Curated annotation (Swiss-Prot), chain B:
Phosphorylated by host IKBKE. Phosphorylation contributes to efficient viral replication and transcription. The gene is VP35. Transmembrane segments: none annotated. This is Polymerase cofactor VP35. Plays an essential role in viral RNA synthesis and also a role in suppressing innate immune signaling. Acts as a polymerase cofactor in the RNA polymerase transcription and replication complexes. Serves as nucleoprotein/NP monomer chaperone prior to the formation of the large oligomeric RNA-bound complexes. Regulates RNA synthesis by modulating NP-RNA interactions and interacting with DYNLL1. VP35-NP interaction controls the switch between RNA-bound NP and free NP and thus the switch between genome replication and genome packaging into the nucleocapsid. It comes from Zaire ebolavirus (strain Mayinga-76). It is found in: Virion; Host cytoplasm. Residues 3-65 are annotated as: Homooligomerization. Belongs to the filoviridae polymerase cofactor VP35 family.
Length: 72, 70, 73
């Protein structure tokens, strides 16, 4: 009947609306992760400071290692 | 378009709504799984608050043991 | 609703669903980008766990050298 055409086109329109809202709601979370990932690209500067401290700590053993060379 | 074409076209869209309902739920699973990869990040981020305490307690210990020596 | 009003609402729902396809197909590209992109980001997280373990291990073992200096200097 025609009331089937009316009832169905209502429900379908409501579900088409729910996709549009949920897609933009999903799309906010995609933009979020994209933006959340950006600062990790600047990790380079921190790893360089880690590289200082990794060598600065080893340099503390300079005199102890000098003794090793003679007495081993 | 006659009344036969509306019954056909109203069903023809209902297929594509069903299709993009599943495609939306596909992309849902892919995102929700990517979000589950933050399990180590929340475990990692909490511990570093406990480990500023220990270094301040270390450095203050260092400052006093140079004061008592000098 | 009239019969011309159904085919208005149906032609209007036809044009938004085809734009909903352009969005879902565009969003899938930015997800597949994040799928590859977040791998090395989450992999670096596992290494920074190691780093914060190792630094705490230094603080502890350095505290032994401090409590040596207390009982020997
Ligand atoms: Hg460096
Ligand atoms: Hg190093
Ligand atoms: Hg500190
Ligand atoms: Hg630490």
């Amino acid at each position: 009947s025609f009331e089937e055409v009316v009832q169905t086109l209502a429900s379908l329109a409501t579900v088409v609306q729910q996709q549009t809202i949920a897609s933009e709601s999903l799309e906010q979370r995609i933009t979020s992760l994209e933006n959340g990932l950006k600062p990790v690209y600047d990790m380079a500067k921190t790893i360089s400071s880690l590289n200082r401290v990794c060598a600065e700590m080893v340099a503390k053993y300079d005199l102890l290692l000098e003794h090793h060379h003679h007495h081993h």
